[PDB]
Structures are given as structure tokens and as C-alpha cells.
Amino acid sequence: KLGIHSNDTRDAWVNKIAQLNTLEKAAEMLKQFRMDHTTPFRNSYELDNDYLWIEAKLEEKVAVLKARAFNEVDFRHKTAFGEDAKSVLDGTVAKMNAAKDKWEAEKIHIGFRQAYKPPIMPVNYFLDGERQLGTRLMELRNLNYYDTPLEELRKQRGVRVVHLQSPH
Amino acid sequence: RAPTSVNAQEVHRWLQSFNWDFKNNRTKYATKYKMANETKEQFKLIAKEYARMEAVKDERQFGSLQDALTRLNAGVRVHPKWNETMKVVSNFLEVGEYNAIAATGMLWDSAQAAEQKNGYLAQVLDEIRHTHQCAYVNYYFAKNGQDPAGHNDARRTRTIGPLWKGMKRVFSDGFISGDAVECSLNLQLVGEACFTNPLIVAVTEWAAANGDEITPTVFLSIETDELRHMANGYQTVVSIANDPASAKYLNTDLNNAFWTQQKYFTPVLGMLFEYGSKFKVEPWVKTWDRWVYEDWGGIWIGRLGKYGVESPRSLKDAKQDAYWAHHDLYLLAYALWPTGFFRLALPDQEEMEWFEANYPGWYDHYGKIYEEWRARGCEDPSSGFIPLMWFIENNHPIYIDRVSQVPFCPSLAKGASTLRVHEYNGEMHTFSDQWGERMWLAEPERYECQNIFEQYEGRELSEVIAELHGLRSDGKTLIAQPHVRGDKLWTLDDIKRLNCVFKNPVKAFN
Amino acid sequence: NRAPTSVNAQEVHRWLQSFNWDFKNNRTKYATKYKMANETKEQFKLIAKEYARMEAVKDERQFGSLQDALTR
Amino acid sequence: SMLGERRRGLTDPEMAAVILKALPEAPLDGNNKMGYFVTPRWKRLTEYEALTVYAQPNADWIAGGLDWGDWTQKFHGGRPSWGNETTELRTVDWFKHRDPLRRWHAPYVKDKAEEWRYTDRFLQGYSADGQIRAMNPTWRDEFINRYWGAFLFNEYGLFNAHSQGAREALSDVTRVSLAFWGFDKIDIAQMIQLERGFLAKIVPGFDESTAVPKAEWTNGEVYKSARLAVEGLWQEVFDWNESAFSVHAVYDALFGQFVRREFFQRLAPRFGDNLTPFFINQAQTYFQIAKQGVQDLYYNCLGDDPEFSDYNRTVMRNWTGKWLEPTIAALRDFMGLFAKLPAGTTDKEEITASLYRVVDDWIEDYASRIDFKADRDQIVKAVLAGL
Amino acid sequence: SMLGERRRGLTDPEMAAVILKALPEAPLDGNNKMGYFVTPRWKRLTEYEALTVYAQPNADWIAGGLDWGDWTQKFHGGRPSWGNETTELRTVDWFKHRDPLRRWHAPYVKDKAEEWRYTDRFLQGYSADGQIRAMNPTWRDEFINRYWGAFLFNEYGLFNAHSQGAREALSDVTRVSLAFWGFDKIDIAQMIQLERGFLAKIVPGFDESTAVPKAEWTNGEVYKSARLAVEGLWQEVFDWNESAFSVHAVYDALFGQFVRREFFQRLAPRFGDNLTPFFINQAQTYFQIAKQGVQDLYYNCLGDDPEFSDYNRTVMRNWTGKWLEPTIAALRDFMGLFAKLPAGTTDKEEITASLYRVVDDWIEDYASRIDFKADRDQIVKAVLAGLK
Ligand SMILES: [Ca+2]
Ligand SMILES: [Ca+2]
Ligand SMILES: [Fe+3]
Ligand SMILES: [Fe+3]
């Protein structure tokens, strides 16, 4: 029942995945799963301890299905959603360069991962985007990194300060 | 017809020209900097010659180990406290050596000048040499030592405890995750230059003082390879000194790198040295000040000033929080002793005198607590007592810093006692200092590491230990122990009876 | 068949006895009252290359211990 | 002082006594086998396995890991230190691979150092024995300085192709093999330059500058497609397995094997050249060493993975088809070098036969393992169009 | 037990204390240089010199010795353990020699072991790369198995020629060099047999038995005079220096260099053979290594001895004339092997040129050092007569 590597929650998902036999169904589930359980913007933290492992087991299924459904050219250049990988990449890099501030940038980069992380997008384009997007994100973030005082920064991040303690 | 040949430098002379220009000849990794594609490496080496100088070093090392040292039974005549300490020191360093492999491979990709790529490449292979050397130390102590457990399975038993998490931050992820240049500062400009190089020698001193001649033999060999990793970290700053982005980003990444590293080693190395040994070499306070403040923060950082490099802004903070950091941490490490893969011991009297002598105020705080604990029978398996219980009873919660992973107890600490708790999108986060807090606020998606309390929540202690194989060959006795004697070792059962169940200390702010 | 193969000491030593051949003055240059059977066999099937290798391995340890741990 | 200031716990009476007094009567555990929990590939666990397997701190979410939880610090954007997202290949366990030569660092530098020291001895014997006399000037100044010399950039580029793998590899066993495969390539490239530097010392007029061979590589015709395929394998592929697989199981198994063995190794002798073959002997030893590792990873572990065998073979067939073409183009352009040879050096028959050897060995050791349907006549004929 | 029964003086508290207590405050002499009294050949004394020079207990009555008095036990009849009577050469000091490569045991086995281990690697790469395919069957089954194979007995015999020198050498430095010169010869001979054994494993029909090559050596024509010269250098010469000198500075410098380099190394390539050349590379490395030592002993030390320079050069000229003839005979009979090669393999011009290379290098490195007046045209023409 309870376990770190093996538990009821994980077994639950293994079965749900064994029931996906369509590239479209499975691919859709993965993108949804990523929206619901990954990144600081996840819809909920209920699977915080198993999402990483579960997501991989899900990618496995989308990968096998995609390989059997796509032809060679498509497997190399199309996303599991039928989109043209290069178009998506170039498109997302376009918006990233049209980013006005570090807050808009992080949204583009993080959303890109939730939507196109392999086996959705082909790794070649993905990691290529990963390099272009990440570079811009940092340029914006590390510029005058310490100017905004913590009091203000906490407000920009929009966190809920639950407690503060400081003898100095 | 005179006998002639060709050496390394005679070929290296043309290595810079090996790389050629073309369209996509650029880094595959995100970076805010631009490494001059004309940078030069300090050591004119080629694969053949590199192999030869490393092989000569191996002969001595392994020769001493397989021969004289084995005949002298050096794997045994070591102080028990140290045999345990080396389980942590060697395996924890092993991953630093190992992630440095991937890290310098990433830098070799980042470099554009053929000579700078080659410089990093030499380290790529060194780090493999060091991963295997550190591995050999545990291998040797397992095969010939007084207690193989831990030495023989740290690669998996280390996952049970909280000290490992913090280790992965400064020597694993801090080495490969982020801007290539940021990682380089973590690994080379700070990690190796400030801590690793001086540390490796320090460890050999403490080892020798406690009967351990194995580590000196291996680590002094690893040490000979470090002057190359310094030149690489130095040449990283040169390659980017003329880029305009450098005057904007360099010092920020350097400051974050400095803090990241010191946050973990300042309290961990001092703890391992002073508490994991019987014979002392020198007070950690004095050691730290020389390494971090003088030699690095002053001498090494001063020479890079002509490249726009300045002293880390968090230097004073680091210094002021440092004084008691290691003493504050051992309390937590010992209190959570069942979560380790090594046996810990409480300070004997001679040691307590030494501590008070070198750290005035030590006895009234830590000293008395340890005596209180020993009195309740923390060392005896029939006492049904574990220091963790003492923390609960006296309302002293222990938190895990969301960023550095360093365990901290603000209600009892003598060093830093700050605590910042935030909630963001349905999750609570705990911070121990202002620098780590800024890092998270600005880069929340870089730090989502689950802490032990989160993962072990609602779990009974003995079950987590058994699940993660924290037992000896008898499947009965624990690897970890609250004393280093040969009798009365705690068994899984002794832990189960305590009926200790983990709680997420943050849920209380609810 | 292009399987990785080589040849070791004994595989060559097998034919070492045949290296010597018969001829007039093929005899000892030293005075002796005895006659050593010219078909005697040695116990260890060694060749120069292999001899060197086993002695060199032994040297590594020895000198390693001396130049390193023992000096320290 | 003769005795030294620092007292050691192993030899200092007072300190050693304290230590001995604290020792237990016997080891606190009889299992003195470090890495005892690792599944042995062979009869007994090997030193190579004990010192390597599981050194990479992977968590269970990366096939085979033993740790748990996310990385402590990630890339801006959220990209993990190591993740399943860096390669299309999937497996039940990334730590399954084993280098058949069982090479960890020590043995690796030991073997290479032996080769280096002998290489030194060889050159000194060669120069003193005055063998350079019997070597044809044209072959020397033309095919060695220019064309063999240009091939160094080919090996150099293949070397660099491994940079990202060194960083992304998903397990220690794979990372170490990969690192060694590439380190051998840079070595070969440096050995090519070592020969040119050696000739410069014994041939009064031989310029060792990399200028000529580099110009041949950058702007020549012979290696144009070869260079185009290299620039592609190196800088256009972001998947670490596609890089290693395509380089070793496609490009270098065909183009590289032909140039090294079927051209220079085969012809240098015919020109009084016993020098170059000395070095090509090393490159071929290295090639055959790397092949054992490449096969074990892509065929024995991945291609035959009990769960993703099908999937993986599909992907590798895809990659073979993707790179077989540029590789054929490289061979074709290379055919142009035979027209430069003095008349009667070789004929279209020898050239075709040697090409068939390279292609048959390739179908032999690589293509057939993933069931890639290869047509030998087609490939050879396509390359033949180059003469 | 875990601690062991035997107590050691370096680690046992009680015993170590007793030891430390008896030590002096500092060394009783600051001269910690073993062999400090030896005259250095180079700027500073070398490890090679310290560990070697004067290990032989010679008395002053044997040029260079430091001991005094007769041997303690001699041969029946009175013959000394070592004496001036075992060689015609004379010198002011038998310990003057120095191996330019400074080889003492450790370095020697180290280098050879490296070569052995790489040889293993090489063969495994060669067999796996399937290069044997491109090799001509006739060259393989004929010239390698029979003629190259027969040459092993030549090297084996040259090896044995050193047996008496190993025993009679008048100094450590000379004995060690001599020993190494001969050990390299047996190695080469065994490498020839290793190649034939290797071919037997990859060529379905190749018999590694030494029968064929041995019959070629014992009853053939190609190597008849070669074998006659070898049997002579080995069993008819009782002077240890004449043996070493004649073998290396005459026979092997002419006949050996021609066969190894001018025949097999030169032609094997032309037949798709890259195997044999791998081994010949070693033999040539060894040859060039030994030559440095041979030159230093017979030319720099003896031929230029400040007291017996004249005498020694006379004796070596005598030996060169004594063995140059049998060596020429060996080369002549060997010429018979070219008639066996397929047509067009090589012509009389290439053969003459290669012979002139061997003779010119010989006059170069050896004959001219002792002022032996050698006529290149004469020598070559005499050998040329052997061409069928
Ligand atoms: Ca005859
Ligand atoms: Ca002609
Ligand atoms: Fe290291
Ligand atoms: Fe390092």
C-alpha cells in the first residue's frame, strides 16, 4: 500500500496507462498530466511524490504509440499532435524574443515544456528550443538581480508570506 | 639518421587550428555569455601524453595500496570514528567528481576555441579518474576495513538521509544545471578553487591523524590533477571578460555560486572534521577563515579583479553565519542518526574540553545537550530514546531549506536563526537565509526539491529504513548507529518499537 | 570468421624445444663431467614478452610502495 | 627534523594505542564486497562494475535509478539535470550497459600510455633506421601531408560530436564508454598531426603547418560531403544517442572504415610508406574496441530491450536511413581522390571490391542487428558514381 | 584475527617506542647518495649507474676493479672466476661502458611488457578488422611460413651466441647490456613464431609446426651460408667480445639488416601483408637500441681507449675481416630467394640499391669507426653473384 518506490498511487496509474491504445488519447493525457502535476504552476500538488515517476511511465506509452503511428519523416519532424515541430519551435522563440520582461519570459519557457516535452515534440527541436528559450530567460532574469528588495520581490512573485523571523 | 621523435607540445602547437568555421558551429546549451573563440589553454597536452602522466600516478597509488599498505593492515588500524567518516567523505566526493564529468563536458561544448575545449576535455577525463578513485577508497575500506556496511552500498543507502540532498545541490546539480558559466563558477571558480583543492589536502591531514593512510595515498594523487581544473575555471573568466554581458551578469552568478557552495560545506565539512574524528588537526573556524576569507575571497578573487570580478556581496553574511554552523548541524545529524549509512559518536571528554577551548560557549549549549541525551540512553537500544524525540518534546522543529537542502532548527540554533515561510500556489516553502530566499522567488521552477519530511510524511521510521535497504547482511541490524562501539548495535526492531512517524513540520502553519 | 583472437606464451613455447638444431660443434664450451640430456623440458612455459610482463607487474607494486606510502 | 613534526596515527605509539584500543574484535559486517547489490553481467562482479555502476545519482523516474525525488537545482525554465527528454530511446534500465573491455579510468590510461611510449620508441627506431628513404616523394608530400592530413579534421569533428553526450548520458556506464569513444577520436586526430610533425623533422622541406590540409578539408572536393556530414552529426543533432549511434554505427563504420582501411592502409604500403600504417594500426584497434561497446549498448541493451526492443529498433532504423544518405554522399565525393593517384596505382575493380568489404562488414556488424534492410549493390553503385 | 598475530616495529606502540628512543637526532652522515664515488658519464649520476656500476666484485688486477686479492674458489686447473684471459681486448677500465638508453632491469621489462600487451591488442584488432583477407596466399603460405619462419632460427642462433658472454663479461655494465642484446634476439625469434601461430588461428589450413621452416633452415639453400655463419659465431668463438662485436657489428648489421629491412619489410607491403611489418618494426627498434650500446662499448670505450685504442682497433679490424667473408657468403646464398618471387615483384636494380643501403649504413655506423677500409662496390658485387 505505502511505499516510496512502490505504492497504491503508482499502481493506480500504471493501470490507467495500460488502457491507452491510441496516440491521440495518450498524447492528450500526457499534456494534461503535465498541466495538472508539473512545474510551480501545476494545478495541484496532490501527486508531488509520484508525478515524476508517473509522467515517465506515461511518456513511455506515448513514445511507443507514436513510433507505430508515425512514418519516418513525421517521427522526425512532427509533434504527437500532428504539428510541424520546426514551426512550433520558431514560433515560440518569436514570442520569447518579443518578451517585454522576465515575468512574461518565464511563462513562455515553462509553458513550452509543459506542452512540448518529448515524446510530444522530437527531442532535437525540443532541446534546440531549450537552448534558445533558456538563454533569453536568463538574460532578462539576471539583469539587476538584486535591485528589487525582498519585501517587493515577494509581492511580484505573488507569494503569501505565512511567517517571517529575523533577530537581525 | 639521428634518432628523433615528436612530443605533446610539438603537436599541441597546431591544436587551436583543429576547429573550423561553419554555420551551426555554436553551443547547444543556453548561456548569457560569449566565450572568445581564440582562448588558449595553459597546459599543452594531447590524449597520449595525458594518459601517460595519469598512468604513472596510478602505479604508485595502487602499488602502495595492494602492497605495503595491505601488508601493514592500514585498512584496519584506523580510528572507528574515522572509518565511518570516510564512508561519507569519499562517497559524497565521488558524486562531485562524477557530476564534474558531465559539467566539464558541457563546458567543452560551450567553448569554441579548440584550445579551450581541449582544456575542459582534460578535466572531463580527470573527473572520471576521480570518480573511480573515490570509489576505490570505499572499495578498499569495504574489503579490508572494520565495518564495510555503508562503504559497500553508499550509492544506494545514502538516499535515506537528509545530508545527501544538500550534497547533490552543490556538487551535482550546481555543477550541471543552469547557465554554463554559472555552473563553471560553482564547479571551478568557487567549488574547486575555494573548497575542493584545500579540502582534499585537509582530509589527508585528518586521515593521517587518525591512522588512515589509505585516503592520503589516493587523495594526494587526486590533488596532483587539480592545478588544471583551476586554470580551466580561470580561463572561463578570460574567455568572457570582453563580452558586454559579462559586466552585467558575471558578479551575480559568482555571488550565487559562492553562497550556494559555502551554504553546504561551511557547516558540513567542519562537522565531518571535528565530529567525525578522534584526533584533531586544527579548529574549523581558523581553517575556514584562511580558505574562504584570505586565500580565496582575497588572494584568488583579487587576481581576477582585472576581468571585472569583484568580491561576493554575501561574503560578510557567510562569515557571520559560519562560526556556529557546523556545531548546529551535528545536533541535527546525530538526532536523525537512524537516517544515515554511517555510525556516529558523541564527543568524549577530551573532545569537549577541546571544543570549549576552541569555541567558548560550546559546553553550555551543545555540551550539556549531548550529556542530557547520553543520560536518557541515546546510545543504548533498550532506552527507547532517539534525540529526535527530544526535539519534539521541547518544541524545536527541524526544517529543510527549499533551496540548499540544508537542515536547520531556528528555535535552537546558535548561528543563523532566521526563518521565512511562504505559500505559493498550494505549496508551503521554508527558507533559512535571505540569499536562498531571493533565488527561489526569482527562479521558483529551479527549486522544487522534495525534502525528507515531505516524502516520509506519515511513514513509520523503521519502514523507510527497511524499504531503502538500511540494514547489514544479517537483515536485522541497522547500518547507522548512535555510537561507534562493537557491541549493542541497534536493530530494525529497536527502531520500530519507538513507533516514530514523520511529520511535515510546515503543516503547523495551518 | 573475424572474432577477436590472439596468441599467448604457452602457444608459442609449445614449439620452443624445436628451436635448437643439430650440427657438429653444437656442444658446451665449459668443462663438465656430466652429460645433460638434450631433450629435457622446463616447467614454466615462458617467452621473453610474457616474462617481462609478469616481472613488470611485480615492479609496479614494489616501487609504488617505496616511492609513495613508505616514503610518506 | 629527521622524524618530522606531524605525528601519524598508524605509527605514533601514543595515538596508535588509542586507536587500537577502540577497535572491535571483528568487522561489524562480513559483507566486505563493495557494490555487492549490483547485478553482475558475468559470472562474478568485476572491479569495473563495482567502481562504476550507480555512481550517477539518478532517481527512479529515470529508468534504473535508485534515488528518489527531483533534482535539487534545475535549469532556468525547469529542465532537469538529467532527464528522459534528452533522447528518443527508451529502456527498462540505463545501467544495463557494460563495456566488454571493462574499461574504467585506470586501465584506459594504462593501455594508451603504453601505446604512447612505444610510439616514441618506434619513431626513434624508424628515423635511425633511415627507412624514410624508400618512401615515394609524391605519396609523402601529396597524399600524406594533404589528404591524410585533412582526414584529421574528420576525426576531430567526430570527437566533438561526443561533447553533448558526455553531458547528457543517462548512466555512468554509458557516460564512461561515450567519453572514451570520443577521447580515442581526438587521439587519432592528434596522431595524424604527430606523423606530419615527425616527417617535418626528417624530410628537409615538409611543412607541418595545418594550413594546407585544413584548406583541403574546408574548401576541397574530396572531403566536401564528408565535412558536411560531420558538421551535421556534430552540431545539428541534440539527441546524445542519435549522435553516438549515427557516428559509430553508420558514418564512421562506412566512410571512416573505407578511408582508413580501404584507402590509406591499403595503398600506403605500395608507396614505401610503413609510417602511416603504424598509426592506422592504432586507429583500427580503437575502432574495433569502440565497436564492442557500441554494439552492447545499442543492440544488446536497447535493441533487445525486453520492453522497448520494437520501439528502439524502429528509431535506430530511422536514424540509419537519415544518415546513410549523407554517408554515401561523403564516400562518393571521396571517390574523386583515386583520379589523383599515379596511373596503375589501382583499378575500378579493386576499388569496387574494397567498397563491398566495407558495406558487407557494416551490414554484418550493424544494419542486420536492427533489421535494417540494406541493399549492397545499391549502396556501392551509388558511391561508384563518384569515380 | 582482525589485527593479526605478528607485531610490527613500525606500527606496534611498544616496539615502535623502543625504536624511536634509540634513533640519533640526525643522520650520522649527510652523504645520502648511494654510488657517490662513481664517475658520472653524464652531468649527474643516474639511477642506472648507481644501481649497476661496481656490482661485479672485480679486483684491481682486472682493469677497473676496486677489490684486491685472488678469487676464493677457482676452476680445476686454476682458471679464475673472471679474468683478462677470456678476451683479446684490453682496456684501462672495464666499468667505463654505459648503455645510452640507461637500461637496468626495471625499465627493460617495463618497455618490453608494454610492447607485449599492445601486441595482444593489435592482433585482436587485426583479426577482428578482417585484414587477412587482402593478403596474397602465396606470400602468406610461402614467404612467411617458410622463409620468414626459417629466419627465426637465425635470430635464435644469434641469441645463443651471447651465452658465453653472459658468463664471461668483465663488468656489470657490459654484462647487463650483453644480456639484454641477446634477450631481445630470442624475443624476435619468438615473435616470428607468434605470427605463424596467429595465422594458424585465422587461416584455415596454416600449419604452425616449425617443421617446414626448420627444414628450410637446416637443409635449404637460401639460408645455408647464413646458418653456417651462425653456427660459427655461436659455437666456434670463445672470446666474449669477438662474439658480441662480430654478431652485432658485422653479421647482423649486414645480413640481418638486409633480410629484415631490405627484403621482408620492403616487400611484405606489396603483398597485402601489414602483419609481418608490425613485428619487424619491433625487431628494428631493438636493433637500433642495441646498436647504441654496441657502439659505446666497442667504439667509444675500447676503440678510443686512451691506452689501447691502437691495439683494440687492430683486433676489431681483424675480426671484421674474419667475419665479413662468411657474412658475404650468407648474403649471396640469400640472393637465391629473389628467383622464387612472382615475376615483376622486384628487379636487379632495386635489389642492388637496397644492398648498397645496407652496406653504406654499415660503413657508416661500424667499419669507419675502427678505420676498416671497406670497398662498397666489391662487397655488393660479391653478393650480387648469388642472383639466379
Ligand atoms: Ca648453395
Ligand atoms: Ca627498373
Ligand atoms: Fe576531481
Ligand atoms: Fe577537479
Side-chain angles (χ1 to χ4, degrees), chain B residues 5 10 14 17 20 24 26 28-29 48-49 98 125 142 152-153 155 173 177 208 213 446 472-473, chain D residues 8-9 29 32 36 53 56 72 74 81 105 120 168 187 201 208 210 231 234-235 237 282 286:
Chain B
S5 177
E10 278 170 336
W14 301 95
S17 60
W20 70 95
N24 308 194
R26 49 86 194 85
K28 301 181 183 175
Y29 294 97
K48 288 298 209 278
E49 177 59 8
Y98 184 89
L125 272 293
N152 60 12
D153 52 34
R155 287 178 181 172
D173 309 310
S177 291
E213 290 298 336
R446 292 190 78 185
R472 297 173 171 260
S473 346
Chain D
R8 304 194 155 243
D29 192 322
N32 62 264
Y36 70 80
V53 191
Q56 189 164 321
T72 72
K74 300 186 289 195
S81 311
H105 199 278
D120 191 30
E168 306 296 339
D187 186 23
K201 290 189 180 182
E208 55 170 44
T210 55
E231 298 180 344
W234 174 9
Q235 297 289 39
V237 181
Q282 289 177 26
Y286 298 176

Side-chain angles (χ1 to χ4, degrees), chain B residues 1-6 8 10-11 14-15 17-20 22 24-26 28-29 46-52 55 58 62 76-80 94-95 98-99 101-102 105-106 108-109 114 117 121 125 128-129 131-132 135-136 139 142-143 145-149 151-153 155-156 158-159 164-165 168-169 172-174 176-178 182 205 208-211 213 279 343 405 443 445-452 455-456 468 472-473 486, chain D residues 6 8-10 15 18-20 22-24 27-29 31-37 47 50-57 66-78 81-82 104-106 109 112-113 115-117 120 123-124 127-128 130 133 152-153 156-157 159-160 162-164 166-168 171-172 175-176 179-180 183 187 190-191 193-194 197-198 201-202 208-210 214 217-218 227 230-231 234-238 282 286:
Chain B
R1 282 178 299 101
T4 100
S5 177
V6 183
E10 278 170 336
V11 174
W14 301 95
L15 186 150
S17 60
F18 279 22
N19 197 22
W20 70 95
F22 70 85
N24 308 194
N25 196 3
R26 49 86 194 85
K28 301 181 183 175
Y29 294 97
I46 57 173
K48 288 298 209 278
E49 177 59 8
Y50 163 86
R52 191 202 60 75
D58 282 355
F62 291 116
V76 173
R77 306 170 72 95
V78 168
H79 198 281
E94 171 184 285
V95 77
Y98 184 89
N99 271 62
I101 307 177
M106 190 184 131
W108 141 27
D109 179 288
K117 283 179 173 294
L121 174 65
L125 272 293
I128 303 176
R129 171 180 151 72
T131 292
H132 286 152
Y136 205 90
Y139 173 96
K143 185 179 63 185
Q146 58 193 281
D147 178 22
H151 272 131
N152 60 12
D153 52 34
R155 287 178 181 172
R156 80 178 180 181
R158 70 202 177 179
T159 70
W164 172 235
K165 299 292 190 182
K168 287 197 295 195
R169 198 291 174 94
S172 267
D173 309 310
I176 61 181
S177 291
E182 174 195 317
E205 287 302 318
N210 291 80
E213 290 298 336
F279 291 116
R343 301 138 58 221
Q405 306 310 299
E443 305 147 41
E445 84 297 346
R446 292 190 78 185
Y447 311 96
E448 320 190 71
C449 196
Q450 308 88 339
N451 67 53
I452 58 179
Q455 175 70 231
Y456 301 161
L468 304 189
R472 297 173 171 260
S473 346
Chain D
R6 172 173 44 254
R8 304 194 155 243
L10 186 66
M15 294 163 72
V18 172
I19 289 176
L20 297 175
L23 296 173
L28 299 189
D29 192 322
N31 178 18
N32 62 264
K33 221 189 185 183
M34 181 272 210
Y36 70 80
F37 58 99
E47 190 170 66
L51 308 172
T52 307
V53 191
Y54 294 129
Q56 189 164 321
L66 310 189
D67 217 318
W68 59 263
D70 198 1
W71 293 110
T72 72
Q73 177 186 298
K74 300 186 289 195
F75 290 81
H76 281 262
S81 311
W82 284 302
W104 48 286
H105 199 278
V109 291
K112 187 177 293 304
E115 289 148 20
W116 178 217
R117 299 236 317 153
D120 191 30
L123 294 176
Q124 290 188 296
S127 53
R133 298 173 301 207
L152 90 71
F153 298 80
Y156 179 70
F159 148 67
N160 271 117
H162 298 74
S163 67
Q164 181 178 42
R167 168 60 222 289
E168 306 296 339
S171 68
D172 37 67
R175 160 168 287 88
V176 171
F180 291 172
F183 200 60
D187 186 23
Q190 304 172 317
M191 289 315 252
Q193 177 53 31
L194 194 168
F198 177 68
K201 290 189 180 182
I202 68 177
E208 55 170 44
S209 168
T210 55
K214 184 173 182 180
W217 170 256
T218 51
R227 174 173 56 65
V230 169
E231 298 180 344
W234 174 9
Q235 297 289 39
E236 301 187 286
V237 181
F238 288 68
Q282 289 177 26
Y286 298 176

Side-chain angles (χ1 to χ4, degrees), chain E residues 21 27 38 42 98 148 199 245-246 253 256 258 261 264 290 310 316-317 339 342 349 356 362 364 373 378:
Chain E
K21 159 112 180 173
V38 173
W42 301 287
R98 286 296 176 306
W148 178 233
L199 288 169
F245 176 89
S246 295
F258 183 76
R261 191 183 74 203
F264 289 97
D310 253 45
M316 288 183 268
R317 270 199 234 72
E349 179 172 32
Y356 267 120
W362 175 67
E364 259 301 11
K373 304 292 181 162
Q378 308 258 311

